[PDB]
Write a protein that binds this DNA or RNA. Sequence first.
DNA 1: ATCGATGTATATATCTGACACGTGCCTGGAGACTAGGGAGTAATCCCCTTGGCGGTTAAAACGCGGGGGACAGCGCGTACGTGCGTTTAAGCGGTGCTAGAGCTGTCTACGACCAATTGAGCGGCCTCGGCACCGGGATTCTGAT
DNA 2: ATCAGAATCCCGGTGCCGAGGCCGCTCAATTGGTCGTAGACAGCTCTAGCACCGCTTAAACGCACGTACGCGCTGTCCCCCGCGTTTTAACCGCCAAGGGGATTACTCCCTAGTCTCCAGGCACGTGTCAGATATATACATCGAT
Lengths: 18, 98, 98, 90, 92, 103, 96, 78, 78
Amino acid sequence: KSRRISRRPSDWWVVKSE
Amino acid sequence: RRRQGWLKEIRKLQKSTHLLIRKLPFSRLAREICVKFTRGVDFNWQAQALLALQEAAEAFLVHLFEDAYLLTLHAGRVTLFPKDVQLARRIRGLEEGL
Amino acid sequence: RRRQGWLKEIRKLQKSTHLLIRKLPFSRLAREICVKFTRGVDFNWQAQALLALQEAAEAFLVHLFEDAYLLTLHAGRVTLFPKDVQLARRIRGLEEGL
Amino acid sequence: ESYSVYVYKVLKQVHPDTGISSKAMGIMNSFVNDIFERIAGEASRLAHYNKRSTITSREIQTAVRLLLPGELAKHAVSEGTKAVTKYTSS
Amino acid sequence: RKESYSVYVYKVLKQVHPDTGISSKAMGIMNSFVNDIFERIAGEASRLAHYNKRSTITSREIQTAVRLLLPGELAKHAVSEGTKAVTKYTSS
Amino acid sequence: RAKAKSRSSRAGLQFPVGRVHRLLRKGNYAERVGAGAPVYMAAVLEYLTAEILELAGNAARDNKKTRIIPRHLQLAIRNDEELNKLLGKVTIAQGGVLPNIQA
Amino acid sequence: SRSSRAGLQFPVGRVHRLLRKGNYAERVGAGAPVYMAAVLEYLTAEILELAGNAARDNKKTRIIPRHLQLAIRNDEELNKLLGKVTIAQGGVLPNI
Amino acid sequence: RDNIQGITKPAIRRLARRGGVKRISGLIYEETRGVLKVFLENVIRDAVTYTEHAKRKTVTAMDVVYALKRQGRTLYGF
Amino acid sequence: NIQGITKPAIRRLARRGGVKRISGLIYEETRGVLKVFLENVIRDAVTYTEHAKRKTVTAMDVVYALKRQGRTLYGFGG
DNA sequence: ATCGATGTATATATCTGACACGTGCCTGGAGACTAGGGAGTAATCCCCTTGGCGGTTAAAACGCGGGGGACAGCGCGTACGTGCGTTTAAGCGGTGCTAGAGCTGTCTACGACCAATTGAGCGGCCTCGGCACCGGGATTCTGAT
DNA sequence: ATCAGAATCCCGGTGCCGAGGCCGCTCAATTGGTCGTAGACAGCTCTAGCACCGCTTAAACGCACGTACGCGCTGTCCCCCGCGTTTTAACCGCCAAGGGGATTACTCCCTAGTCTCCAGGCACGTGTCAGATATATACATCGAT
């Protein structure tokens, strides 16, 4: 499949360092 | 003895209109940023493109500082803090602070 | 006697999804504020128009309150003050806060 | 008119046993309509900026690259490059 | 060649002020500004006409467009300035 | 003539390609629309709908519900970082706020 | 010679060609270019009068982009119309 | 008997509790009533405009969501 | 190479912003927010250029990217 | 710091109105051919970009005293949460009505389109004066008295 | 309360380069005419918003009380700011080389357009169950003690 990876970074917006 | 001389600097910098950041390190930073997404090949820049980018970045930064300083004085203190500017970016919106 | 019951209210209200404000006073207020710009002639209102208006109004209001809560926690207190929501509307922008 | 079929079709394809309410159907319909309008407007100003009158496959690809965020777009681009190469294959 | 609105803003500037000059950067600023405003009202009028199943951009459409786009007070003069020209344009 | 095969069937997609072709032709975006342009559009719309419906199904499976309600759509769209950026300016009707309590 | 037919300064033919080439709609009306040229002329006349005031109070006969920013930020309606804009070489308002 | 005080204190309280507010001061109820006024003064003033262009006298659900989309914050499902 | 926006430069930017006092921990995050702003704007302008068959980013593409993001810039557009 | 009675999670019946599917019908989509032009592709030139060298110089960096600033602790009085009694207006449902949305037919005045004509708008030249810079002088606070 | 030295304002001088005026060219605006049709207008029909009545009942209003917290003050620690000295790379000025931006010309394959037929999509209808709701049971709990 290779569906897009989902992570939960501390930042609400995934702009810097994912 | 020159005491409390920051107000004169505030007035002088608010009256002026020229760019505050130098052009050569900013252009080096712009090229360092642009080299990452172009998968390797070197791109050329126009003389006015870098000037427009510097003007837009200065406007963005002056907006962030001028709306975060009022957040700091809203908390009661006069020192600007990074948590305050982070909160300002969080509350300004997805397209206004980011 | 039920102690610290605001947590249960917050959990139940964030778990639910129905409209909070009533329908008849909202429709009355909407008609009374719409009679101003219609140059004096009464207008009709569809059944879904009032519902969509109430949904948009409650969404905007709940977003304003959740964003102002961050500013209140930033000031070191827990109660909400009108200066805080005014500051939130001011930092949000001219179009976003008004 | 509004299309509620294809959404149900792709929903049954991705999940064989899940239904959908009528309101969520209208939500998805309005959502795809808005996304289609945004991508089309982006592609239109793209073609207008370069003195072009035809909207080829490159314009819509660059438009969706501008509109959609980074990690998704790649995937989407792949889907695009997986579609046309079959459509012109026949 | 290149197109611009530099001559018309110069004429209206000479009309509003007989002895005031204009620089070159301000020229480009006003040019880009009037282009952006024109594009905004034209696109908004196009969306409104497509909303109402219309294919012609009659003056009513852009009137409603500028009335919707501009703030309250300015529109009160804007609609008072457009029709006054239209009523003159129909004078022939 | 040959059999009437729709281009959506020959492209391996579920979204209609002729419908979006007519919509682009009447959408006043440009006087000429390409051939592969509606196909790309149908593919990306199909992918986006699949992504949001898969998230909605994951958000409805844990609640022991086999029907997608508008609350599930909000819960699924606000749990994805990229979909939140795509749908940040928009708000969903009949959708509650995410349960978050500050310390 | 119908550019000054309605007594305006902006051309009606240029905006007509721009409307026909912008692909906003398949058809355009007759009074729409005249109305649009008139409203654009009014907007630019307002902002130029404000800039002329902002230049005469500084004893400068040549307008500068700083005065444009000053005039666009003093008035509340022009600021409301141009909220997400940035003027090149335009300093921030003298506020403390 | 004004329609602006129709939004009672428990209604605004429930709105704030949904927003995650712990404690509310007493001067908030008089403030947001103005804010909710202004937000309801900007939307419909656009909506009626969308009904002034057509020859209609009603505010349909399409006009409200159109005005909201023009403002920026739009709604799905209508 | 991100050290170009030095400490007196950010200090002067804050002075133009009306800020009086500046903590010593700001210079580790203002560079980051400048970096993310540039990484957004430059990436939009560079895909704008790459759509056409060119290799040099021009000032028109930068202002196009800025307009698509939301903060339009006048003066260089033409 | 353990225990309970208050609340919480779950299991079972019901019944329902929305959901899924099935049918009929037709208008939009597909197959086929045309002819016309916007776009792909090669040449070219020269304008703009990149790169480098030397010389300067204001800007940056570093170090240090200090006094103003952030923050913790604490008392106080006030303002808001909570519970209970009371009342009031939202809300359900049921009926009736008609203003107005919506569809249809028609006729036309309006706008697209093409050819000939030319004058308003754009490119190049210049020329000079408004503005930047600098020196001198008079004033006016701000730290100093 | 009372005051002098840099900071500020204003004047004059010199300069110099960008703004405005002028001229020549030229293609987009104008004029004239024609033809097809989008929409204005009327008119007709059906519906959905509006208005009312009766009744119900849950939410709102108010009042009192308790206590949690916004606010003001004080004290202590410290870390940006100002000042001086040393260092440096940003910038100016100049030159050289060439990369590809922009323009032109040729051709041709893609696409609007038109017609012809038909099936995928929409309106309507109807059986059926997912879930909202009521009731009962097992279990974690947070305040009194």
